[PDB]
């Protein structure tokens with residue numbers, strides 16, 4: 001009943017226990033830039049005050065599938081069809097050995113990791129769950145991460161505290177910090193398209209936005225992420241790695257680019 005990225009209950013058998021995962025518009029996908037359709041009318045994505053997370057501690061949790069961070073309802077994502085509000089944010093990465101841990105690809109190439117910022121249509125619904133199964137109910141920002149030659153102070157707000165939640169279900173609080181700083185500096189270039197959640201139930205309720213520019217973290221940081229979290233509640237511990245879903249069929253969906 002507890003699904004996993006691989007194994008007997010890997011992303012291959014998801015469609016069985018969660019039919020929706022076999023939908024006609026799943027995510028992530030391999031974004032082929034040659035098929036990308038330019039749309040000069042796509043308004044700039046703009047995170048209103050994502051450096052203003054207030055005063056109260058943010059919740060840093062360990063699913064067993066990822067590291068998730070809570071976000072204040074004060075973060076408002078503009079530039080989209082409806083008004084969205086930030087709810088949570090989490091990461092995806094590969095195992096120690098590999099350097100491919102992102103969920104989306106660009107022209108068949110994946111990066112070291114991926115950041116996902118989840119929003120919901122608070123304009124039309126009252127909860128994140130409510131919009132999780134409503135058309136266009138969710139909106140996710142996808143930031144691809146590469147290994148840089150320098151330590152990223154932004155990402156440390158999260159990485160520096162990974163030991164506090166080494167085991168699954170372990171929780172903790174962090175001093176609020178500028179989320180904005182976790183995105184690439186230039187957000188003009190991006191791709192948009194209709195998709196789904198990348199984990200069961202795989203609800204096809206999300207409006208995706210994947211940035212063209214990438215964010216960077218030191219090989220040290222990427223390592224501290226790969227080799228620190230366990231996917232179990234206690235010992236024996238089992239490395240929570242390779243937590244990304246494979247590119248899904250495009251099923252003839254159009255993918256727009258702002259550039």
Ligand SMILES: *[C@@H]1O[C@H](CO)[C@@H](O[C@@H]2O[C@H](CO)[C@@H](O)[C@H](O)[C@H]2NC(C)=O)[C@H](O)[C@H]1NC(C)=O
Nearest residue numbers: 039135136192193194195207208253254255256
């Ligand atoms: C995501 O899917 C929705 C619905 O399938 C698309 O909405 C339609 O968009 C076209 C052109 O933009 C309009 O003429 C239709 O009226 C829209 N349908 C309605 C009323 O929802 C939307 O364009 C898709 N988003 C993208 C660009 O991927």
Ligand SMILES: CC(=O)Nc1nnc(S(N)(=O)=O)s1
Nearest residue numbers: 116118132140196197198199
């Ligand atoms: C309840 C909820 O928000 N679930 C999500 N499941 N997968 C998500 S992801 N990886 O597409 O951002 S969000």
Ligand SMILES: [Zn+2]
Nearest residue numbers: 090092116198
């Ligand atoms: Zn995700």
